[PDB]
Design a protein around this ligand. Sequence first.
Ligand code: SF4
Ligand code: SF4
Ligand code: FES
Ligand SMILES: [Zn+2]
Lengths: 77, 47, 687, 114, 83, 118, 83, 198
Amino acid sequence: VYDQVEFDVPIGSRGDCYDRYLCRVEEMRQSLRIIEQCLNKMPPGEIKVDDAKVSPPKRAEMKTSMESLIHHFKLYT
Amino acid sequence: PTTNPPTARKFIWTNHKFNVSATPEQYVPYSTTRKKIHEWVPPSTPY
Amino acid sequence: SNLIEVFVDGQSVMVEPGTTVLQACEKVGMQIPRFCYHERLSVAGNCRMCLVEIEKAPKVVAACAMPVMKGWNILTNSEKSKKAREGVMEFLLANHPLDCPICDQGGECDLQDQSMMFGSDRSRFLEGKRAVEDKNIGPLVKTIMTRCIQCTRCIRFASEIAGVDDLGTTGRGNDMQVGTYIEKMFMSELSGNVIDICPVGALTSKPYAFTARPWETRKTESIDVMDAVGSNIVVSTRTGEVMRILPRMHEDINEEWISDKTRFAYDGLKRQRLTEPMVRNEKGLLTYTSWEDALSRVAGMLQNFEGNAVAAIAGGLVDAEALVALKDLLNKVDSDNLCTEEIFPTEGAGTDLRSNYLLNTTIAGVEEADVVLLVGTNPRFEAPLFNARIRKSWLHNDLKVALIGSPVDLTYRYDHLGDSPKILQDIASGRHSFCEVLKDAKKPMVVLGSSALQRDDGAAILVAVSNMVQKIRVTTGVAAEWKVMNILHRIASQVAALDLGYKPGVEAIRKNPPKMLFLLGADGGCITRQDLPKDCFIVYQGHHGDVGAPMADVILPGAAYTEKSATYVNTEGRAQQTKVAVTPPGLAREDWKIIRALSEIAGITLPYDTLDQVRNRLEEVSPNLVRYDDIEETNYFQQASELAKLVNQEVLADPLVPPQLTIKDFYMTDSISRASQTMAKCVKAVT
Amino acid sequence: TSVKPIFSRDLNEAKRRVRELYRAWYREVPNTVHLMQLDITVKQGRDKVREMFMKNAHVTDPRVVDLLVIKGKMELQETIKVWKQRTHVMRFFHETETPRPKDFLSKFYMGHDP
Amino acid sequence: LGLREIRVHLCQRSPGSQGVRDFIVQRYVELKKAHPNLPILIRECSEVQPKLWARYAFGQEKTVSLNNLSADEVTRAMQNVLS
Amino acid sequence: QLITVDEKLDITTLTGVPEEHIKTRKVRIFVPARNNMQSGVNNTKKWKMEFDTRERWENPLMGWASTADPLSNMVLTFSAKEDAIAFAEKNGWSYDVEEKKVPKPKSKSYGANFSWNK
Amino acid sequence: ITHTGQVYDEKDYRRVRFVDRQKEVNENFAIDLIAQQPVNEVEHRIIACDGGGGALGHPKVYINLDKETKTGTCGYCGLQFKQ
Amino acid sequence: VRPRSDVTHKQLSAFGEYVAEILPKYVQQVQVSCLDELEICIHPDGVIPTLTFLRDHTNAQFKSLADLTAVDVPTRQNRFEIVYNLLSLRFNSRIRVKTYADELTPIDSIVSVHIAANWYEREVWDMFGVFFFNHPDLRRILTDYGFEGHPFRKDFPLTGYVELRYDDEVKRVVAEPVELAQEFRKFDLNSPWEAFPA
Ligand code: SF4
Ligand code: SF4
Ligand code: FES
Ligand SMILES: [Zn+2]
């Protein structure tokens, strides 16, 4: 999501090691603007895709459902 | 730990130790597996 | 002709009429997820995990059991055929106990993978599971049968590949448990295959219970040396000790199966094993010493002794490469008293034509035979994967089996002509009833076991059989490439030894006692030290201290077939190469080098210094040794008979009896077998 | 057959280049033994150069030879433009490692797999 | 020259070996009957011309090529070997 | 213009392998069989060439397996027998190819199991 | 000594390692500690051992306590249950 | 399931045809992955020409070289597969031009077309052994000064053949043949069951 957060790229003008420093200091400031948006707009939801084939099954599920233990065993091994 | 004491499980240590590395109590690594290829010991009785 | 064209997703494959839908997908290359269907086991349809969708058809069809029909398109990956698998896998898993970190068929599961590949990611079985009481089916197979997916491949194998017919289904509903109704152990050779054939880890191997996990196991493809069928096998080694030996498929020799002996006697390979070269001390006990000292003990005696005072009694599991290195050495001191423990009659042409001593009708020729005349051997316990051959060809084809031996359990219906070597003469005369049966056979085969030959009238028994094969051939008018006479061995290093011109039997050593004897892996009692001359200077060349070690002035430890790139050859002369799965233990060394080195310490120094050279050597003395996997087609039976006719001998009335009368006889035979704790546990279970 | 030429059209032209490199190394051995304070003899080193230049005497193909000198030239550059310090150079002499016998009896006495 | 063994490494279905195999078919039995102890080995090479290997006493082996040789030349060569 | 060479590409001189492991190492080109445990055949498809196995002595301090052979764990995968043979020739390793052995066609039909006389 | 009877022989030199040092071993051995726990007398043919603590325990498994003679033992805890 | 826009698979596809048409003497295959990435494939001789057209064409300006790499398919006669990934800051698109080079059949160098390649080409020589003609200064970059062998080749042992330790006798670091105290455990991981037709 860098399409749903708003920031300004700090383009420098001339290229001396100062303009590059100033750009790096601005990106720290612009990142605080992006961090602000992320805390303000973080959605309720799951943190990993729900396909057991790609992301490992949850600890409770692998210890109670056979399809999850098989998926945990195969994914880790 | 005083306020909410921990769970005791009748194996956990009562005297916990600090780094024993310079002192003789130190872990000395060793293989814990038993022998694998047992050998034919020669007959002790002269033929 | 006979080539329907069926489309597997529009690929227009063409198949013989009769091919199943699963088989049609295989030739295109697609693989229907399958349980309960094994190529060499009958189709049962129990799992229904293979449901596919022929085009324009209301219901999905059972791949493994549906004769394909013209035009059909399989739609194997159709949305439907995936719901037909996403919903079956739901069921197999629902009653399954999730102890995958107990199930030692962890990575060797055709049910997790077929679930990780063809099934769903979750479960909806919020209800409770079932549990089935376990069974002590035996001391080799651990049946944690709460794992069973009721796929009935065991009940098939236990009836179709092996003739046990014991395992069976008991009950109906969700508590159908596939275990012996009364607790009777599944005691039979071919027993351990159930492990390999149950895709679930319900019943698995008890010795290899929890020693490893398959991803770790490094897999080296080698050859079975315990029996003379020379079954192909894969030795699974982890961090340098063998963990398991499981079959690898050879269409002609062992087609996916291996004997109970050659997969649970890998444990015997790890104890009582010689490693350092001990020598007899002044005190009279074997003292471990460096090679240099042990080798010159032997070399000095060798230089002192002339020809016919030095002899070698090889035998058992020694490879062809050592056998030529021991002959080349003893000829360089001119004794050609090299011999093997198993006596093959050698008064007529023996060892000279290569058909007197081979099963030249191939292991795969038992499938196209018509009548088999088993004479004096128990195939069940002398060549278990050849007994199976006659098992399959008596079931799927129609072999008429006849045994002239002891009436013995043969896992099939044989005709017991009698227990007398002279009744062989009865058939030759045409007097006995089965004489016509053969007359009626267009492709017959006689099989004379080596153990019948090991009796005193073995020369006469071979001659008597050759006469009958002669007129059987004349009366049937069988074609030349069909070969009626063949003899099966039960010692791995016997066909190779006879090939290199080793003369069978210790009869020659018996008549003149050698001052020196190289026992190259001989644990047999063919000669003993009381029998030897006063000096009795003999040096054991082998891997396990059993009978030859404690009566040995020198111990030169060698290796075993898991530990060297040697060559072996089974009974119809197919030479095969063992590969080094594990480096040999201790100071122990490869058999061929010990003898090349002893020669260099002696001054007759064998010309070969690298294996490839020892092989080139094998090529000059014999052809089969260098060409691997290649049976030698032509043979010269006609001239063999002429010399048989010259030989006159009496077949004594004593019935010819196989030494392995019942299965306890079978479990412990060779050195590695004898040294097996698993075999020992099996022996006491029988007793 | 039908190969494209890397830099040398034929073993002949290629050999020319090898000659040049040999000379280069020959002229350089002394300098290195002094700029690196190596404890070796110029003569000794120069023989080593010969050793290497012949270790690959068997190559018959022109393309393989050409790469061999490219690589050879690169090594020289690392030793004359000094980026390779003594540890690097002396390694050529295999000074610390214990030599292994090639006699069969010798190997038999020591290693499982020769 | 002590003769210990003779190896006739014929090659089946090979043009040259025809003579060798013919010898085996017609005279092998006879030779054996005559020398009933000596081990005469009939072996089958491939993609190699036939060789009558002979092992003399004290580990010396000698070679006589039988490539494209007639049945009696094979018989004569064999007879020359066990002098 | 191209030049002609009949010399089998041998590039043993460029690969950078120690002399001992180019002249004493035999590699086998084989198609892997299937552990009988599983019935899947997706690991019996591509040819692999594997170098000969070497010493695996036990380590004294921890008992871990220890190996002195560098080319041990290396198994290269080649799609066809011809290509794998080529790799051995130009790299100079000795080769001993094993022909692929594929299961022979087997005739099966559910009707048979209910045969009047089998 | 250790859980598996790992005891360096009287002549092995790894014993030098233990010279002037403690060979680390644990007095609490599992083979024994599980024994102490008594057999659980459940009253249902099949019971489940979730491992104690559910998600904080071991994968759930059902044990068949039908065999009257023996007692079911969780392949995980080792806990035994009898009907 | 990832969101896929076919706008790109169409735009990029068309461009592929455009490049191919403009440079037919070298373009052998031009494909767009299902991941919306173009991958013109060129004969090794077209290294200079195809790149230059992309660096300096108004309708396809591909100014910077993202990367130069060489996969090694040992089976493939031409072992290496030099892959050049380029970016067009003007058209916000990347393309990959991949060629094939065998061990002793060198590729041309593009240091002229992009000087970024001065280092990556040295990296490809050091790791894989491909040689680049007309390179200003080709010499090992990542490997040790005396290293023998090209490391990322699939035929090179991971642990390698030499390791370093300090020897007192000689008071200097010294190579010795590698002796490992726990060999790399080579877990076999491939499952015997396929996933889909692909
Ligand atoms: S069989 Fe063993 S491994 Fe395969 S799933 Fe059931 S438990 Fe897990
Ligand atoms: S035991 Fe193995 S084979 Fe016999 S049924 Fe249960 S699962 Fe199928
Ligand atoms: S395989 Fe189709 S029914 Fe089990
Ligand atoms: Zn538990």
